[PDB]
Amino acid sequence: DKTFPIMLNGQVNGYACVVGGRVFKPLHVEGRIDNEQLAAIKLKKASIYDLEYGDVPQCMKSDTLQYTSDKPPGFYNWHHGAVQYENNRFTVPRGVGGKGDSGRPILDNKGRVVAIVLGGVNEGSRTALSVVTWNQKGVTVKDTPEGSEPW
Amino acid sequence: DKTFPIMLNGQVNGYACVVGGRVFKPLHVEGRIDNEQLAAIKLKKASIYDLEYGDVPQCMKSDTLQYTSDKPPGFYNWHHGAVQYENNRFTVPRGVGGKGDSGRPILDNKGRVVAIVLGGVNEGSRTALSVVTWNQKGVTVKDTPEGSEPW
Amino acid sequence: CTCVAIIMVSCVTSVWLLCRTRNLCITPYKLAPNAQVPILLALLCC
């Protein structure tokens, strides 16, 4: 797995992570990408999408496995423990999921990155997030609960 | 099983292999076929297809069993070990699948030659190949990943 | 003389194109040796 922080002013401001099929960088924030191999790659950002085009030589291509439909409620391994929910983002503990750690992938226990967080700072006594994943049939759609800011 | 190297200048340059139903010779490369029984057979090559017509007397006809649809990801016995993949050609080890050994059949563990390699020298830190087999309903179609040269 | 020459050359060009198109129509029968489902087209398949 290659999940890389983004270098801004010599400190971490983002967190770039490569995914199956295409290499991914969260283009919501800026900062020089730490990896030198990615340091010479053109940027392809859409109006609302903040994703890097996949231009890694196909030796290390598809570092991960993408995620299909049929979301279970079960455990998804997160950087800070497992997450367990199905209707929307898991009720992450308070304090966790704040700010400054943009671009963190949530993966299945089977190695299938279910979604990519793009904010969702607080959602009450619990907290869900604003993320993007396949819609129902494999459509890269973002869902943003109200009160969502990059985390 | 009758898999035969092709004799060019008295050394192996290709590898002819007979299949169920029809006798097969990879016509991509040249060289006198080692087998004398095949030495007196007319050649039937298409624009992109490099296959020999089946003109062996029907005593040794259908040396193998052809391969149907529903590709499993499981093990297929290859000349250099088993191969395990479903989306495309298996991630063969680096160094293996180079050049000079054109015309090598990949078989099912059940004796069903899933496909015929026609190149695919390198595909990165792993390697897939350019092969031909039934498409979905039994159609002899070739798939060529980018960066494919005869192996 | 000119008319017979031009009509015969037109006809022979047409028949060459006929042969080439026939070759192209032969090409898909690459699937024929595969012993597969009939296609139900202008040519016969058991």
Side-chain angles (χ1 to χ4, degrees):
Chain A
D1 62 326
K2 195 270 184 172
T3 60
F4 225 9
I6 306 173
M7 287 308 105
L8 181 53
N9 302 116
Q11 71 271 355
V12 178
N13 69 325
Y15 199 57
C17 51
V18 61
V19 194
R22 172 186 182 178
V23 323
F24 283 43
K25 193 279 201 186
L27 311 179
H28 163 261
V29 299
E30 66 282 0
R32 192 265 316 173
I33 172 60
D34 193 308
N35 195 278
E36 79 303 327
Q37 178 183 1
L38 309 190
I41 297 187
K42 299 273 296 189
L43 184 143
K44 295 306 182 67
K45 168 195 280 298
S47 65
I48 48 173
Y49 294 86
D50 302 332
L51 233 41
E52 172 48 59
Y53 208 78
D55 300 332
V56 157
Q58 37 104 58
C59 309
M60 293 67 48
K61 211 59 184 180
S62 297
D63 211 314
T64 74
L65 170 59
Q66 58 183 1
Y67 158 79
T68 49
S69 295
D70 196 322
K71 178 187 183 193
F75 286 149
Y76 310 96
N77 40 14
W78 171 256
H79 194 88
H80 315 136
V83 303
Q84 169 90 31
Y85 195 44
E86 194 177 357
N87 299 264
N88 41 276
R89 288 311 93 197
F90 159 76
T91 149
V92 317
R94 295 302 302 279
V96 204
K99 270 221 65 270
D101 182 58
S102 58
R104 269 272 182 82
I106 180 56
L107 186 91
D108 181 22
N109 41 81
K110 296 299 109 183
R112 316 191 66 258
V113 48
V114 32
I116 301 301
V117 306
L118 200 52
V121 277
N122 170 39
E123 301 301 332
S125 177
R126 310 306 298 114
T127 291
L129 283 83
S130 68
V131 304
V132 50
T133 179
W134 303 8
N135 161 271
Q136 183 41 64
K137 312 148 187 176
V139 191
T140 62
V141 184
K142 327 188 184 68
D143 179 86
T144 62
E146 311 317 308
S148 51
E149 239 246 344
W151 135 238
Chain B
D1 62 326
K2 195 270 184 172
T3 60
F4 225 9
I6 306 173
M7 287 308 105
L8 181 53
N9 302 116
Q11 71 271 355
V12 178
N13 69 325
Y15 199 58
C17 51
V18 61
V19 194
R22 172 186 182 178
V23 323
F24 283 43
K25 193 279 201 186
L27 311 179
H28 163 261
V29 299
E30 66 282 0
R32 192 265 316 173
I33 172 60
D34 193 308
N35 195 278
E36 79 303 327
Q37 178 183 1
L38 309 190
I41 297 187
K42 299 273 296 189
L43 184 143
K44 295 306 182 67
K45 168 195 280 298
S47 65
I48 48 173
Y49 294 86
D50 302 332
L51 233 41
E52 172 48 59
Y53 208 78
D55 300 332
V56 157
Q58 37 104 58
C59 309
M60 293 67 48
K61 211 59 184 180
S62 297
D63 211 314
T64 74
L65 170 59
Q66 58 183 2
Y67 158 79
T68 49
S69 295
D70 196 322
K71 178 187 183 193
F75 286 149
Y76 310 96
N77 40 14
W78 171 256
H79 194 88
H80 315 136
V83 303
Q84 169 90 31
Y85 195 44
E86 194 177 357
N87 299 264
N88 41 276
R89 287 311 93 197
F90 159 76
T91 149
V92 317
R94 295 303 302 279
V96 204
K99 270 221 65 270
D101 182 58
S102 58
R104 269 272 182 82
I106 180 56
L107 186 91
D108 181 22
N109 41 81
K110 296 299 109 183
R112 316 191 66 258
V113 48
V114 32
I116 301 301
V117 306
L118 200 52
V121 277
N122 170 39
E123 301 301 332
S125 177
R126 310 306 298 114
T127 291
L129 283 83
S130 68
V131 304
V132 50
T133 179
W134 303 8
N135 161 271
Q136 183 41 64
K137 312 148 187 177
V139 191
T140 62
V141 184
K142 327 188 184 68
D143 179 86
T144 62
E146 311 317 308
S148 51
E149 239 246 344
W151 135 238
Chain C
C1 303
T2 55
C3 88
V4 301
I6 61 187
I7 63 184
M8 67 182 61
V9 69
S10 58
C11 94
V12 302
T13 53
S14 62
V15 307
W16 183 97
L17 187 48
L18 280 161
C19 100
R20 220 35 56 106
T21 51
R22 193 230 79 266
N23 296 288
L24 304 185
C25 117
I26 296 306
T27 54
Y29 313 146
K30 80 244 163 296
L31 92 174
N34 201 21
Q36 305 304 304
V37 50
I39 321 298
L40 289 75
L41 260 302
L43 271 302
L44 60 95
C45 45
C46 183

